[PDB]
Amino acid sequence: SLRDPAGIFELVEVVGNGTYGQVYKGRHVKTGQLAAIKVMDVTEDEEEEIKLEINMLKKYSHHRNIATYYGAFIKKSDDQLWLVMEFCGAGSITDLVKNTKGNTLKEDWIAYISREILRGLAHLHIHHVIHRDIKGQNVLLTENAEVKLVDFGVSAQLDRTVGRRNTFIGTPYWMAPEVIACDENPDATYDYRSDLWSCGITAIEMAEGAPPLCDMHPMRALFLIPRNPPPRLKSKKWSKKFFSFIEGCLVKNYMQRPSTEQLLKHPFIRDQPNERQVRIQLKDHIDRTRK
Numbered sequence: 001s002l003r004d005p006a007g008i009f010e011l012v013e014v015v016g017n018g019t020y021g022q023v024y025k026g027r028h029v030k031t032g033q034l035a036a037i038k039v040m041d042v043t044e045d046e047e048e049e050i051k052l053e054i055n056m057l058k059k060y061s062h063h064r065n066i067a068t069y070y071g072a073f074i075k076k077s078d079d080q081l082w083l084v085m086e087f088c089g090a091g092s093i094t095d096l097v098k099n100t101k102g103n104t105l106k107e108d109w110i111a112y113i114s115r116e117i118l119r120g121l122a123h124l125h126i127h128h129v130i131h132r133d134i135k136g137q138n139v140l141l142t143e144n145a146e147v148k149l150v151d152f153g154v155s156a157q158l159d160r161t162v163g164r165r166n167t168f169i170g171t172p173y174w175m176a177p178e179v180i181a182c183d184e185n186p187d188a189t190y191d192y193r194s195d196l197w198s199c200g201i202t203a204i205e206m207a208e209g210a211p212p213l214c215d216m217h218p219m220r221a222l223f224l225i226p227r228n229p230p231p232r233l234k235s236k237k238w239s240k241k242f243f244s245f246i247e248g249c250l251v252k253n254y255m256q257r258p259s260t261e262q263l264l265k266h267p268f269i270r271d272q273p274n275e276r277q278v279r280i281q282l283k284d285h286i287d288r289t290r291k
């Protein structure tokens with residue numbers, strides 16, 4: 001039932017990569033409006049599973065902190081599946097830190113971005129959806145400094161032979177301990193609280209420019225996350241509220257880790273006086289980097 005994108009959408013250039021496939025800057029032919037397009041090689045037997053993934057994307061993307069779902073297309077050739085969503089022109093928060101002097105963001109910026117992540121997560125969690133891949137690369141900015149989540153998990157449940165696009169393991173650095181299977185955790189599953197650990201790692205990334213364990217081989221990092229104590233910010237310059245926020249996100253045992261609603265009520269998230277100027281400071285930084 002998925003039509004060919006010819007005359008509807010066109011690919012302009014590559015903007016990045018997912019765990020599988022590539023993400024392009026795309027254009028709606030008739031209006032010229034931009035859209036981001038996730039292009040992945042798919043076989044004709046993957047079709048039934050993809051249709052189930054589509055309905056999940058459509059249903060839970062209707063929130064201002066989640067990139068909006070536009071539509072799905074199959075470019076016949078293996079064939080290509082095109083997942084069309086809202087374009088977030090200012091790129092990822094990973095790019096934002098990398099393109100800032102000293103590779104560090106102001107604490108009030110971290111507070112604003114983290115709250116927006118948490119609001120997007122709260123919307124997903126209330127609908128029984130775990131994001132499963134929160135990281136700076138999956139947290140995007142638009143031209144008017146709006147924060148949007150991308151690439152929330154839509155797979156599994158069919159017991160089938162997992163399709164090629166779902167056979168890859170991404171980066172481990174933002175993974176919660178409980179998600180990594182070991183001798184004491186044979187069936188390591190995602191809990192909604194696994195996203196909160198990832199949110200905490202993302203705040204360290206905004207603060208230091210890199211997640212903890214960045215100097216290690218990804219396989220070595222995967223082994224250390226379940227064994228290592230909660231990660232900490234290296235500098236002492238940070239406020240007591242920021243250290244307390246990181247502590248909450250990064251409670252080692254997920255069983256005592258706070259919920260998304262509890263973390264949205266944390267003073268570092270809840271008490272944002274300079275909220276108005278932060279959004280202005282971000283918009284001005286977006287334009288400064290663009291040119």
Ligand SMILES: CNC(=O)c1c(C(N)=O)nc2n1[C@H]1C[C@H](C1)c1ccc(C#CC(C)(C)c3ncc(C)o3)cc1-2
Nearest residue numbers: 015016017018023036061069083086087088091150151
């Ligand atoms: C400048 N923009 C981007 O770089 C940009 C944009 C975007 N939407 O603009 N999207 C991405 N990127 C980067 C590549 C990687 C991060 C990346 C990686 C994965 C994805 C994605 C995705 C899907 C599953 C299609 C989605 N998410 C939300 C919905 C409704 O559907 C998107 C992106």
